[PDB]
Ligand binder design. Structure first.
Ligand code: GTP
Ligand code: SAM
Ligand code: ZN
Ligand code: ZN
Lengths: 284, 678
RNA sequence: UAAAUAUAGUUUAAAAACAUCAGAUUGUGAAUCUGACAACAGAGGCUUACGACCCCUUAUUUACCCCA
């Protein structure tokens, strides 16, 4: 394609472009319909390869430092199998959670409104979210709702989880949350909700929108939560935090960590400790 | 080295509504040509920031050109712009002095008039020439034409070309020399004195455009024999990109004007701004009215909308790009599709059901009709203009309660082709006080009334204006210095029509008699309302019996209550919202509760609220008090006495339509309370 | 309306540190190894280049209260 030759002249001009581009990424260069959009894409690949190089250089630096250390160089109760045993322990908790645990829903109905960039970030955030849930003392029973089998978000989840996808102790279904739970016990979380969250309710199912809208579309979570007559709630960020800068729409990982410690009989202060510190200047 | 994106955008496309206005954009400087009545709004509505303006160029000293000029200065004063230069006729100096009669000291902002006598205005972007054109047999004869010549732009550096000959690339290293390469100075590198002309792209000589106004047939001959124009006509080294013609259709068709237009290159684009366009300017007004029309077609009527040289007919937000390419950009052209507005309204949560249920519920003389031409304070917005209420006493008589910048345009979009008969119908204008939103529209109505009388063939006689004395001084100055308007006015001081007023001169007494006789009224009283002095409310009593009362800007006033006893209709103001009582006392305004309470003391059969703020614009916050007696005015809302019972029923549909804006206004109230607490 | 402001895991800095994910039966530096992910709000420009410079959108904060 002409794009392969196209990038050549951009390389000469030194517009922050990386050394080589994989054929996969060539396809995504065709997607960009603007010079400006191409610029933002090339810069991302430029910084990506730079960090790859720096990490590798720091890697083999460590490897060379480790091998020279080896040259320089009892009654135990336990073998060192802690990482293995922890994974098993977290497994047992996950199975228990799937039977008895409180539901928590991620709504995956937002693929349409997201671009490729935002879609990977959602999956990155989902990965972190499930992790914090896994490692918790009282895990949520995590539901992936409105997840198409052949969808982009499903395809991306499978890639990041590999064989672990099948073995994850969460429920993924193409069905909606209104189909799985009584409609009265569903509280949809969104920053745009007029209703403030006063206390964490253990009888309620909370729905979190799997939506990273860097290109901000306000009210989309609220619109879904109104089309289906669901209750909406927003976090008491205004009440407890001195908001100065930043978006009040938090990331998924932050949301779950706020809920997890709310569920675990914490107060709002302990909960809002996960709210990015750059966004507020203390508790009021 | 000069701005790299320059374009001309058409604010007003020359229709009878808006006049002509031309907005010039660059990276560094923003210009506006002319400043008609309603440019301020046309610009705010279309997200053209006025806060950045450097010069306002005015082609003529006419109310068409300078109507909205007193308007912007107030506003861009607020934005906090330190300086603004008015370029055009020398009489602009005296115009500014006239404006200050009612507009306050106009301190905080510096207005320096640079007339056509002055040397040229040089900028980052362009150097602007003023050409004074004098008609063939205070100056009525002066128009100014603008030739705006863009500065030379340094050629783009070709790094490829440098490395082609073997000269080092040095994106950062040779960057000091790159500046010299841009400047075109010879480069010592490559072991020889290589000129930088070949290194950089060809520097464009600079594009010029002409803004020429030819008001009528007089000015055609002077334009065609102008020495200054002839310099830019046919001279190869100096091409003209665009000409913006603000001439009417009659002027352009003339052989002499056609020949002159041909004399600019065949490559020159010609833009025309005149009445032939009749494009839509105020989109949001059209949108809202189309949606309001669903609720009640009668109370919310529809707004009326519509060779030798290749000319491009001006449309709103039409764009001609000068750099980095010369082309017509038609991207941001205003598109109005009524069907789309309807579908959007119908898709709203509860609007469909509320409107439907109104019709289920549904299933006095026709005159007077009160037409609310505009129902907002101070700065005009998308949805509400400044103050105007039209009272149609009879098919053949009407009376204008206040007339502000934008008012004639409201009338013109309300009536369309029928504005001629309405203007000829108009008998009186009442001005409550001398705030610049109650009278600034008057000169347009005066001038347009003249045009309407000529078309209908009726004799031209003065318009009866009831206003404070201070208005005469403003108009006397404008008449003396700028433009003749005082022959259109027979002014009755508002203090003459007060109850227990001393018998004025026999002239005024005779004028008062003609006021009553023309409008077919038994009484026309005024009283001193409580609004920063010399502020009046009026009462119309018609021979039939009905009384209608206009408060104007005021506070709760005993005098107005005593005057308007057992009025059929009260028109009061709700500029502030309930809970902002401390705002009202200092601004000398009313809240919604206060306004209603005044109505109830008068035993008014119905109460309409106007002069809302923008703080409550899209939908005034409907207090629960007195549903059946209280109504809310929108622009282009027609109210008869027959419509008194339907007005209560319109609230459920109206609330549904403006539900989005209600939420936000309620949050402001809640946030304010939180802010008060914190 | 005007101003600053906007780190999608968190900070700091003007790229790192700490985090995240998959694999591992680890002889107790696994204090590791092999992979995955790497986008300083969003869109479009200008320029030799830039997170500067322009513009728009959204959002935050504050000021204003609407043309005082
Ligand atoms: O141009 C502004 C301005 O005139 C006005 N405005 C709103 N809040 C303030 C304020 O605190 N101070 C001042 N001086 N002016 C204020 O609103 C205009 C912006 O309105 P938009 O047209 O951008 O949006 P709109 O309200 O129509 O939006 P929506 O509520 O219908 O969604
Ligand atoms: C970044 S938000 C998505 C923003 C989207 N525009 C919207 O309208 O929600 C990702 C999810 O986190 C949750 N969330 C984030 N901030 C929240 C807040 N302040 N209150 C409640 N839920 C919040 C919501 O469930 C939301 O769908
Ligand atoms: Zn007013
Ligand atoms: Zn007033």
């Amino acid at each position: 394609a002409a794009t392969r030759e196209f990038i050549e002249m951009w390389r000469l001009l030194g517009r922050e472009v990386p050394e080589h581009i994989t054929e996969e990424e060539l396809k995504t260069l065709m997607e960009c319909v603007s010079n400006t959009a191409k610029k933002k894409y090339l810069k991302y690949l430029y910084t990506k390869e730079k960090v790859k190089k720096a990490r590798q250089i720091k890697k083999e630096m460590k490897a060379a430092a480790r091998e020279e250390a080896k040259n320089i160089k009892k009654n135990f109760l336990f073998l060192r199998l802690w990482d293995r045993n922890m994974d098993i322990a977290m497994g047992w908790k996950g199975a228990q959670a799937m039977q008895f645990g409180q539901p928590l829903v991620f709504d995956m109905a937002y693929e349409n409104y997201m671009k490729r960039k935002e879609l990977q970030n959602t999956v990155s955030q989902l990965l972190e979210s499930e992790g914090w849930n896994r490692r918790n003392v009282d895990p949520f029973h995590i539901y992936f709702c409105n997840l198409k089998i052949d969808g982009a978000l499903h395809r991306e989840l499978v890639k990041r989880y590999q064989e672990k996808w099948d073995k994850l102790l969460l429920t993924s279904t193409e069905k909606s949350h209104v189909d799985l739970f009584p409609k009265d016990s569903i509280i949809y979380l969104t920053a745009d909700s007029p209703n403030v969250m006063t206390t964490f309710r253990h009888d309620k199912v909370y729905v979190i929108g799997s939506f990273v809208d860097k290109s901000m579309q306000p009210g989309t979570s609220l619109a879904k939560a109104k089309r289906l007559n669901l209750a909406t709630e927003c976090l008491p960020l205004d009440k407890y935090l001195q908001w100065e800068i930043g978006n009040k729409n938090l990331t998924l990982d932050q949301m779950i960590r706020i809920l997890l410690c709310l569920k675990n009989n914490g107060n709002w202060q302990e909960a809002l400790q996960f709210v990015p510190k750059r966004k507020h200047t203390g508790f009021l | 080295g000069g701005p790299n994106t320059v374009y001309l955008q058409v604010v007003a496309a020359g229709s009878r509504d808006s006049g002509a206005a031309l907005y010039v954009f660059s990276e560094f400087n923003r210009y506006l040509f002319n400043c008609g009545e309603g440019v301020q709004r046309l610009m705010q509505e279309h997200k053209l920031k006025v806060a950045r303006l450097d010069n306002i160029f005015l082609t003529r000293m006419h109310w068409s050109n300078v109507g909205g000029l007193s308007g912007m200065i107030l506003t861009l004063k607020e934005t906090g712009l330190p300086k603004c230069v008015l370029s055009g006729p020398p009489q602009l100096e005296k115009y500014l002095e006239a404006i200050k009669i009612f507009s306050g000291p106009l301190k905080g902002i510096e207005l320096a008039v640079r007339p056509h006598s002055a040397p040229e205005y040089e900028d980052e972007t362009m150097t602007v020439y003023q050409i004074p054109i004098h008609s063939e047999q205070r100056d009525s004869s002066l128009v100014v034409a603008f030739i705006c010549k863009l500065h030379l732009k340094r050629g783009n550096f070709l790094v490829l070309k440098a490395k082609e000959m073997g000269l080092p690339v040095g994106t950062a290293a040779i960057a000091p020399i790159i500046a010299a390469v841009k400047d075109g100075k010879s480069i010592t590198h490559e072991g020889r004195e290589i000129l930088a002309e070949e290194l950089c792209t060809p520097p464009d000589p600079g594009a010029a455009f002409v803004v020429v106004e030819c008001p009528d047939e007089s000015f055609i001959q002077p334009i065609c024999e102008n020495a200054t124009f002839q310099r830019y006509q046919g001279k190869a080294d100096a091409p003209v990109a665009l000409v913006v013609h603000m001439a009417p259709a009659s002027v352009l068709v003339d052989s002499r004007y056609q020949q002159w237009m041909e004399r600019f290159g065949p490559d020159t684009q010609h833009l025309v701004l005149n009445e032939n366009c009749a494009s839509v300017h105020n989109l949001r007004s059209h949108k809202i009215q189309t949606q309001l029309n669903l609720i009640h077609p009668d109370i919310f009527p529809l707004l009326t909308s519509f060779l030798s040289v290749p000319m491009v007919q001006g449309e709103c937000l039409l764009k001609y790009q000068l750099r980095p390419r010369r082309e017509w950009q038609r991207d941001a052209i205003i598109t109005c599709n009524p069907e789309e507005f309807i579908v959007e309204a119908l898709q709203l949560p509860n609007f469909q059901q509320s409107v439907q249920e109104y019709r289920r519920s549904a299933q006095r003389s026709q005159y007077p009709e009160i037409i609310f031409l505009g129902t907002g304070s101070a700065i005009p917005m998308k949805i509400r203009n400044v103050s105007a209420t039209l009272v149609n006493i009879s098919p053949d008589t009407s009376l204008l309660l206040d007339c502000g910048e934008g008012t004639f345009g409201q009338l013109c979009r309300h009536y369309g082709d029928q504005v001629d008969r309405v203007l000829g119908t108009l008998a009186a204008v009442f001005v409550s006080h001398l705030h610049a939103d109650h009278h600034t529209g008057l000169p347009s109505i005066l001038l347009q009334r003249e045009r309407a009388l000529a078309s209908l063939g009726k004799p031209l006689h003065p318009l009866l204006v009831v206003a404070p004395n201070q208005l005469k001084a403003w108009l006397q100055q404008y008449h003396n210095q700028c433009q003749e308007v005082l022959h259109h006015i027979s002014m009755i001081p508002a203090k003459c029509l007060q109850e227990g007023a001393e018998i004025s001169s026999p002239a005024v007494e005779r004028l008062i008699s003609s006021l009553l006789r023309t409008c077919d009224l038994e009484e026309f009283q005024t009283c001193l309302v409580r609004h920063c002095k010399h502020a009046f409310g009026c009462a119309l009593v018609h021979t039939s019996g009905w009384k209608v009362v206009y408060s104007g800007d005021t506070m709760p006033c005993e005098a107005l209550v005593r005057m308007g006893k057992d009025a059929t209709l009260l028109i009061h103001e709700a500029t502030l919202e309930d809970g902002l009582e401390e705002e009202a006392v200092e601004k000398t305004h009313s809240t919604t509760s206060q306004a209603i309470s005044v109505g109830m003391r008068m035993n008014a059969e119905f109460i309409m609220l106007n002069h809302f703020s923008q703080r409550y614009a899209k939908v005034p916050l409907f207090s629960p008090n007195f549903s059946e007696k209280v109504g809310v005015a929108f622009d282009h809302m027609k109210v008869c006495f027959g419509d008194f019972p339907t007005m209560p029923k319109l609230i459920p549909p109206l609330k549904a339509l403006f539900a989005g804006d209600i939420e936000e206004m309620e949050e402001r109230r809640e946030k304010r309370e939180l802010r008060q607490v914190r």
